[PDB]
Amino acid sequence: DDVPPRIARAMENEEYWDFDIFELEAATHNRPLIYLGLKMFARFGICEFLHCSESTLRSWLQIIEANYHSSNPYHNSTHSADVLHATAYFLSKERIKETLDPIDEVAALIAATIHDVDHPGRTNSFLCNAGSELAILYNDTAVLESHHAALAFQLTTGDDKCNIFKNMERNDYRTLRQGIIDMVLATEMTKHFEHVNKFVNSINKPLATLEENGETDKNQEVINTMLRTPENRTLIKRMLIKCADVSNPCRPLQYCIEWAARISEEYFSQTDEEKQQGLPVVMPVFDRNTCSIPKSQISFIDYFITDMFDAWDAFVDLPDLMQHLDNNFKYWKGLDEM
Numbered sequence: 001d002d003v004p005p006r007i008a009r010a011m012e013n014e015e016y017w018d019f020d021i022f023e024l025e026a027a028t029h030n031r032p033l034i035y036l037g038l039k040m041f042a043r044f045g046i047c048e049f050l051h052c053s054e055s056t057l058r059s060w061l062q063i064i065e066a067n068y069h070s071s072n073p074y075h076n077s078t079h080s081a082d083v084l085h086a087t088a089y090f091l092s093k094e095r096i097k098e099t100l101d102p103i104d105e106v107a108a109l110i111a112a113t114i115h116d117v118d119h120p121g122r123t124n125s126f127l128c129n130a131g132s133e134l135a136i137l138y139n140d141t142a143v144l145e146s147h148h149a150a151l152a153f154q155l156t157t158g159d160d161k162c163n164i165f166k167n168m169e170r171n172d173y174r175t176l177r178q179g180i181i182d183m184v185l186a187t188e189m190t191k192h193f194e195h196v197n198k199f200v201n202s203i204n205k206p207l208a209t210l211e212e213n214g215e216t217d218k219n220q221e222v223i224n225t226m227l228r229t230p231e232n233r234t235l236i237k238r239m240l241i242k243c244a245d246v247s248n249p250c251r252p253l254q255y256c257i258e259w260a261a262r263i264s265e266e267y268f269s270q271t272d273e274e275k276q277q278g279l280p281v282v283m284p285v286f287d288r289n290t291c292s293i294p295k296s297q298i299s300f301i302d303y304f305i306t307d308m309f310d311a312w313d314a315f316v317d318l319p320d321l322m323q324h325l326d327n328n329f330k331y332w333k334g335l336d337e338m
């Protein structure tokens with residue numbers, strides 16, 4: 001409530017897509033998530049739904065943000081706040097507003113907040129090759145995604161002052177827990193094409209089929225009944241967390257570039273550590289001594305971003321994201337020059 005002035009000004013236009021996430025990061029002193037979380041959760045009315053106090057939410061936001069590693073270039077608490085900001089923005093669109101229910105909005109906002117908690121600036125494949133404690137613990141299977149979700153529930157329910165779920169119904173919490181886990185596990189890179197194709201086949205193609213019938217009141221109710229089933233909501237939630245997680249190439253160019261630098265530097269570090277130790281190089285192209293960052297972003301956009309956001313856009317209508325996506329793609333091309 002009683003927030004300082006620069007951070008208050010930094011969080012002024014958080015409903016808008018164009019938002020200065022790095023000014024918030026600078027102003028909050030590597031604590032963007034607690035400030036942005038408090039505003040978002042209050043605006044969506046999350047503690048009113050969960051029956052937590054504002055103090056239990058402050059304690060919760062602090063302990064999870066504390067477990068984000070500041071030393072990570074990209075996977076730090078600013079990424080989580082960025083991913084939280086995009087999640088809120090997608091939940092605020094009419095399509096999602098008239099498809100998802102209140103309990104899904106809470107699962108989405110929480111999942112965004114925790115999805116990368118205690119990330120070690122390293123990929124799953126590094127941990128598996130290295131034989132890390134988590135790779136042995138999770139059996140080389142969604143090693144970090146499992147850990148992010150697990151630790152988040154360990155820190156939440158392990159302390160009474162941090163437990164934002166303590167005043168819930170047994171059945172509401174069990175449903176919410178399942179929804180958070182699913183969305184956090186859905187961010188694993190290996191399941192990308194499985195989750196994009198399920199979204200196209202179960203949502204976009206059936207919805208495009210029903211679009212031929214014309215705008216009718218009976219036809220809208222059939223569209224409403226089909227989309228609002230538990231399965232298709234799970235497919236929409238997975239798509240929403242996936243798009244928010246990698247929404248950086250759809251940002252204003254200044255932010256797009258900054259995100260590319262952070263993620264690249266984090267992969268350059270891993271590749272240096274793989275060479276020094278003699279581990280098998282999983283990302284050979286991402287070495288500081290060989291990598292073109294503009295070319296690597298173009299390739300990244302082609303393989304993952306283009307088809308995924310095209311499908312999400314066709315469902316939600318995100319012209320500003322796709323307009324930024326075109327401008328940023330064209331900027332990366334413009335840096336060749338020879």
Ligand SMILES: Nc1nc(Cl)nc2c1ncn2Cc1cc(OCC(F)F)cc(-c2ccncc2)c1
Binds near residue numbers: 187192245260
């Ligand atoms: N601008 C970005 N560039 C690159 Cl190179 N990786 C990024 C970026 N923003 C998030 N990531 C992380 C990420 C996510 C991802 O997929 C989203 C979901 F499927 F997990 C795939 C890769 C990735 C996979 C293989 N080679 C390179 C990068 C990296």
Ligand SMILES: [Mg+2]
Binds near residue numbers: 116145
């Ligand atoms: Mg992750």
Ligand SMILES: [Zn+2]
Binds near residue numbers: 115116187245
């Ligand atoms: Zn992430």
